[PDB]
Amino acid sequence: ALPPLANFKDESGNEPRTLVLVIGESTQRGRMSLYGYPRETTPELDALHKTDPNLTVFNNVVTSRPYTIEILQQALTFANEKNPDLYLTQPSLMNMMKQAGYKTFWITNQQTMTARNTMLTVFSRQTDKQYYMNQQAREYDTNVLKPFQEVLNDPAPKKLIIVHLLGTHIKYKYRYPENQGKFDGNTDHVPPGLNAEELESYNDYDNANLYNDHVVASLIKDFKAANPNGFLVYFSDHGEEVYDTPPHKTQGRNEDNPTRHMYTIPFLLWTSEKWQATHPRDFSQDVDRKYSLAELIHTWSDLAGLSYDGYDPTRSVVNPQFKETTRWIGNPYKKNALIDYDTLPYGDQVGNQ
Numbered sequence: 001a002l003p004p005l006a007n008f009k010d011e012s013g014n015e016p017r018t019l020v021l022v023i024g025e026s027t028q029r030g031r032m033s034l035y036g037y038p039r040e041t042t043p044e045l046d047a048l049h050k051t052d053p054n055l056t057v058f059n060n061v062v063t064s065r066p067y068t069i070e071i072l073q074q075a076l077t078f079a080n081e082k083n084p085d086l087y088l089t090q091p092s093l094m095n096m097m098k099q100a101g102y103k104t105f106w107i108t109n110q111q112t113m114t115a116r117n118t119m120l121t122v123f124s125r126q127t128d129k130q131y132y133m134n135q136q137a138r139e140y141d142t143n144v145l146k147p148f149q150e151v152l153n154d155p156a157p158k159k160l161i162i163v164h165l166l167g168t169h170i171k172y173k174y175r176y177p178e179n180q181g182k183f184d185g186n187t188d189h190v191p192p193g194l195n196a197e198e199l200e201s202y203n204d205y206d207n208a209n210l211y212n213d214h215v216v217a218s219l220i221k222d223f224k225a226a227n228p229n230g231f232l233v234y235f236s237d238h239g240e241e242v243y244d245t246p247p248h249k250t251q252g253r254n255e256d257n258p259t260r261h262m263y264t265i266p267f268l269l270w271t272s273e274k275w276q277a278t279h280p281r282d283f284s285q286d287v288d289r290k291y292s293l294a295e296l297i298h299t300w301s302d303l304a305g306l307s308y309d310g311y312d313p314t315r316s317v318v319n320p321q322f323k324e325t326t327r328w329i330g331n332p333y334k335k336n337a338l339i340d341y342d343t344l345p346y347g348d349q350v351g352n353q
């Protein structure tokens with residue numbers, strides 16, 4: 001029902017390309033070894049970072065809200081903390097890619113109620129083809145690998161593939177097979193004072209991070225094996241507090257009682273050899289920019305070569321005109337409840353910038 005973006009231009013040429021957006025779940029930045037966590041929770045992404053120069057790891061990206069649909073309404077559209085309702089009145093990322101001539105796909109391991117009017121159902125239905133892999137629980141994110149490959153074989157020249165993961169969502173133990181609890185009973189690098197149940201939950205979160213590492217690295221590896229022209233962006237919708245913050249008694253997500261570990265997120269960009277060769281771009285000076293996921297659509301636009309009325313290059317984290325703005329958190333529907341993420345304590349801790 002919304003009109004297309006005005007003065008729409010695509011400067012990325014007309015060669016076929018495949019662009020991938022991997023939406024993880026409840027994965028914070030501070031529990032991945034890729035970001036300095038002393039437990040080896042992400043070995044495959046670490047090795048990929050060591051061996052592949054086209055993997056760009058962003059170190060200072062946070063989400064704006066710690067609830068899935070509440071953040072995705074901002075990340076996937078032009079809405080943000082100051083204007084949270086723009087997802088109703090302006091196009092989404094998927095709409096934008098359709099206007100650019102892409103065939104769009106939604107692959108998900110999250111239980112979607114297709115017969116019901118949920119906001120996630122609407123977003124996934126904004127694409128040309130959907131793969132609902134979890135419609136009924138032990139359904140692991142590797143479920144997405146088979147349809148992903150299938151979509152890679154789809155003959156459309158320009159393709160957008162969205163992969164929605166369960167990631168490290170509660171309950172953590174159910175995110176990975178029972179025989180893959182590498183950190184079960186381990187007490188190294190554990191905060192003090194946990195009881196048996198809290199300790200088991202902590203180690204469960206690290207195990208879920210291990211499996212999520214395997215899944216994301218597998219997506220990148222299979223994508224690369226297709227020898228594609230394009231790139232893949234991986235981000236988590238939000239983090240998750242798992243006894244990280246002193247006094248180490250809190251587990252979960254609470255917007256009105258925020259901690260940094262609820263808001264820090266991984267943010268990775270893998271660029272294929274063909275795309276890097278055809279679209280030369282240096283990201284090495286962008287990796288430490290302080291950025292909020294709420295403006296993702298501009299970064300994506302920048303990466304896709306798209307410009308239009310409403311495009312803001314200064315809010316793209318890969319743009320030379322990038323200008324840091326306040327990384328707002330807090331409920332945007334309460335009266336003047338927005339606060340600067342930087343004001344939260346314990347910002348000096350590893351992975352908690």
Ligand code: NA
Pocket residue numbers: 074075076077078079080294295296297
């Ligand atoms: Na937005």
